[PDB]
């Protein structure tokens, strides 16, 4: 049983974790770099400490600085948040050696699920489907064809470049693609070695939330559809996913719990899947809290940050899978402070006037305030806008109202993009796939129409 | 086992205890009134706390204030020193309830030996001689006569001595005069009788005991040279005692100490005349003159108190208690010896304390220090040790001459005169040294230099 917890993060997540501390009667300690001295999290905290220079490597990624800060402030446990050292086994082992409790999974589980190759191996061991692929180098075009027969076309040739250097839909196309992929890797990537993986034309990004305790009890807290993404960075997330059936939800939840228990998991974690044509494929596991935990948090009525802290103190799970029931629909839009219409290039500046939307079913998890100069040295996420409704339609309407009535004056945000998407017929129908943005450029025209002039 | 101790005293003694703490590796915390903010003991200590205004009752005698300071400073034990609250059982109990260790005797023993009458009774048990007396109100002159024969003339009439009666016939006049005097001045008018010693010597025995009942006697001290009834010079050993008498008195002291349940350091004071010793009272604390016993017996009594407070059993036995040499201490009080020892006040300008082998100075003052008036006169104690008494006297004379304390008058001239007096040189100093030799003050004046502030 610990009384003071140190939050090794910044911005939105740090405030989110601190609020959980306050409700639980625990003291929260903030760590801050020189850039985030006038940051909201520092003030909210009961105590605080300079972790170091603005450089991330010398501040929030500096393990010794965080531990030293915990010793000076008397913290007994550390919440990593999302990002930085949250999935860093070295940080976990250092924290354990200092006598501190890590509010997260154990180091060994974190390592076993760290790399993409290790996780897929662990997932096949636990009977979780993975993307059909051969990670060892493919020598010639004939092996590609044979691997194409087993996997099922289309398949994708990639190099040791995460996305396919080339996508082959037929056996005939493999000779040209194999030649093309080899030069491209040799010249640029510098290694002629390739490998083959199954290709999904129009997948959907569906992830399963897993919560476990120190004593081997694990439960699945539902799904999330994080399909709308630019590049590979998520922009909109919703719960539940319209594409899943009640049976698939349980089937995937069971798979998630199997892997979590098999690896010895503790605390909160997220298993990410790809879903197409009624089939789900495991990709990776995040051994931390999820940025989009908010939607699950509102649909299943669970405070995951509080849950993380309790199991960290050693509590056995206070509920069972029968108790996990979804009610309503939640959507989250990321206020990422980047310029839409300009290839989401980072937008920086000072926020002048700040007025957050309010109402029933509206939540704002923010790391910014009015008259705040937004640090450029780190992330772009200013805040997260989350709405809840009785049905998906209600939640969308609230998100539409909240987006319009969110006032951020000094800096450009992607709020126009969100408004266009939430009006889009494809999104309204629940057909948004990973290729939603690429396939519908009409989004950016409407975004320009809704974009107030910012001037300087 | 404690790590930090708070010294509930000021001036000389507070520094003495702090030095012991530092040597034993313990942290010492000081307490001071507003007057002693610039005092040496506050600067020396590892930590300090302001307990109150200059008034003794609102500062160094404030039990609740001292305990609160200990909590704020993290102190786990308290050393009373030799004055304020050292022999106050209430202070001990407050310290016990707060969870801190009292570096001294236990409360119950302190109480049993608190009053002069109570100590005398505890001394009658355990077979320690006491001054032959009644201590219960006498009714008439006839009782005085009968008590006079039983005790042996001379005897003395006292009240709750007023007059000394040398013959049986002299009892009626003295009783009448003694009664009226008591009624008029002390509003009591009830008397008691005690045997009178014409030319006594003040000899005291130092005793150390542990929580576990082991007690040892650490020798004698001659505190005969006093003004009024306040000691000015003390030496160890006493020239009047014989080795056998010294052992007999030490044995009595340990018996009395053990019977009362004593822990820590204490001193039993006797009166010595015509080869016979009489118990008067016991001081349940460290003594100001512990220095001389420390020099002759080579023992750190303040460290000893701390060890006994931490629960150690005595690390030595009576066989280990051996005197070597002779030590004398002259108390450097700020008083004008030539004008009825009137209090002297001022600011000390230039301060240079004597140095050398066999020279010790326990002081509570420094150069350019304004001496607080609200308390005592003891600025410092000058102690010398020698191979024999002559050596100790010579070093005391040199140290006395070479002690420079400018701005304030001290009795340092008087001391030098005493150490030249033939009676002292022989060791015939009795309680009535100063009263019977008024030539000391003549010499004092000659050695008194012209002074200015």
């Amino acid at each position: 049983m610990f009384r003071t917890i140190l939050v090794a993060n910044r911005g939105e997540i740090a405030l989110r974790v601190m609020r959980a501390c306050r409700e639980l009667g625990l003291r929260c300690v903030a760590v801050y770099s020189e850039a985030d001295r006038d940051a909201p999290h520092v003030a909210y905290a009961d105590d605080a400490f300079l972790i170091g220079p603005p450089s991330p490597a010398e501040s929030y990624l500096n393990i010794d600085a965080i531990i030293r800060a915990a010793k000076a402030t008397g913290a007994e446990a550390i919440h990593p948040g999302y990002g930085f050292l949250a999935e860093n086994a070295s940080f976990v082992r250092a924290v354990t050696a200092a006598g501190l409790i890590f509010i997260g999974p154990p180091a060994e589980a974190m390592e076993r699920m760290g790399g993409k190759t290790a996780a897929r191996r662990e997932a096949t061991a636990a009977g979780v489907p993975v993307v059909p692929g051969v990670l060892e180098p493919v020598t010639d075009a004939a092996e590609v064809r044979r691997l194409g027969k087993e996997f099922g076309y289309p398949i994708a040739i990639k190099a040791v470049g995460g996305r396919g250097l080339r996508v082959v839909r037929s056996p005939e196309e493999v000779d040209e693609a194999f030649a093309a992929a080899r030069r491209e890797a040799e010249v640029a990537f510098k290694n002629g070695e390739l490998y083959v993986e199954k290709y999904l034309d129009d997948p959907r990004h569906i992830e399963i939330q897993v919560l476990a305790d120190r004593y081997g009890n694990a439960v699945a807290l539902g799904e999330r559809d994080c399909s709308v993404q630019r590049r590979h960075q998520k922009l909109i997330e919703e719960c539940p996913s319209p594409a899943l059936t009640p049976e698939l939800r349980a089937e995937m939840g069971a798979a998630a719990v199997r892997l979590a228990k098999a690896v010895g998991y503790v605390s909160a974690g997220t298993l990410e899947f790809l879903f197409q044509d009624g089939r789900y494929y495991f990709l990776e596991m995040n051994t931390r809290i999820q940025v989009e935990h908010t939607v699950t948090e509102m649909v299943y009525g669970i405070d995951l940050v509080a849950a993380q802290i309790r199991i960290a103190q050693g509590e056995k799970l206070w509920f069972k899978q029968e108790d996990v029931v979804p009610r309503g629909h939640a959507i989250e839009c990321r206020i990422n402070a980047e310029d839409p219409l300009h290839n989401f290039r980072p937008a920086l500046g000072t926020i002048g006037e700040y007025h957050e939307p309010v109402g029933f079913g509206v939540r704002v998890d923010s790391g910014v305030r009015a008259y705040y100069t937004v640090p450029s040295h780190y992330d772009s996420l200013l805040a997260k806008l989350i709405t809840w409704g009785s049905d998906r339609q209600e939640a969308i309407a609230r998100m539409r109202r909240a987006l319009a009535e969110y006032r951020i004056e000094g800096v450009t945000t992607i709020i126009p993009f969100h408004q266009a998407a939430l009006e889009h017929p494809v999104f309204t129908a629940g057909a948004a796939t990973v290729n939603f943005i690429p396939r519908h450029p009409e989004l950016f025209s409407r975004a320009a129409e809704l974009t107030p002039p910012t001037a300087a | 086992m404690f790590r930090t101790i708070l010294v509930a005293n000021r001036g000389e003694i507070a520094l003495r205890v702090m030095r012991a703490c530092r040597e034993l590796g313990l942290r010492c915390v000081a307490v001071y009134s507003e007057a002693d903010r610039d005092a040496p003991h506050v600067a020396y200590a590892d930590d300090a706390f302001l307990i109150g205004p200059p008034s003794p009752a609102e500062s160094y005698l404030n039990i609740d204030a001292i305990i609160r300071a200990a909590k704020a400073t993290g102190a786990e034990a308290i050393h009373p020193g030799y004055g304020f609250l050292a022999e106050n059982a209430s202070f001990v109990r407050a310290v016990t309830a707060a969870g801190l260790i009292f570096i001294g005797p236990p409360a119950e023993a302190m109480e049993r030996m608190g009053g002069k009458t109570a100590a005398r009774r505890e001394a009658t048990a355990a077979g320690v001689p006491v001054v032959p007396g009644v201590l219960e109100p006498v009714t008439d002159a006839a009782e005085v006569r009968r008590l006079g024969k039983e005790f042996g003339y001379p005897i003395a009439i006292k009240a709750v001595g007023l007059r000394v009666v040398r013959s049986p016939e002299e009892v009626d006049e003295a009783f009448a005069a003694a009664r009226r005097e008591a009624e008029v001045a002390f509003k009591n008018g009830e008397l008691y009788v005690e045997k009178y010693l014409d030319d006594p010597r003040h000899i005291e025995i130092q005793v150390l005991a542990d929580r576990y009942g082991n007690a040892v006697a650490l020798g004698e001290r001659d505190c005969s040279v006093q003004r009024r009834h306040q000691k000015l010079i003390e030496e160890c050993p006493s020239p009047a005692l014989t080795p056998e008498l010294r052992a007999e008195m030490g044995a009595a002291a340990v018996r009395l100490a053990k019977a009362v349940g004593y822990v820590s350091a204490g001193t039993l004071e006797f009166l010595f005349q015509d080869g016979r010793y009489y118990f008067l009272e016991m001081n349940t604390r460290i003594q100001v003159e512990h220095t001389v016993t420390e020099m002759v017996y080579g023992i750190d009594l303040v460290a000893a108190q701390i060890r006994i407070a931490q629960g150690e059993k005595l690390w030595f036995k009576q066989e280990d208690v051996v005197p070597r040499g002779h030590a004398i201490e002259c108390r450097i009080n700020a008083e004008d010896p030539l004008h009825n020892f009137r209090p002297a006040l001022g600011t000390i300008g230039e301060y240079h304390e004597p140095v050398g082998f066999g020279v010790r100075v326990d002081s509570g003052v420094r150069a350019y220090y304004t001496v607080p008036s609200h308390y005592d006169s003891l600025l410092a104690k000058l102690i010398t040790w020698g191979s024999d008494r002559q050596e100790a006297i010579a070093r005391m004379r040199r140290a006395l001459a070479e002690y420079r304390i400018e701005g304030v008058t001290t009795i340092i001239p008087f001391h030098q005169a005493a150490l030249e007096h033939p009676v002292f040189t022989a060791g015939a100093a009795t309680v009535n040294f100063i009263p019977r030799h008024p030539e000391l003050f003549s010499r004092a004046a000659e050695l008194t230099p012209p002074t200015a502030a």
Binding site: D46, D47 | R37, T370
Partner: peptide, 23 residues
């Protein structure tokens, strides 16, 4: 002599303290 001190009341993270500065 005895210059009087400068007395201030300082609140550090909600904790009231009485401070006296000398010199």
């Amino acid at each position: 002599p005895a210059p009087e001190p400068r007395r201030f009341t300082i609140e550090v993270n909600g904790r009231r303290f009485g401070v006296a500065v000398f010199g």
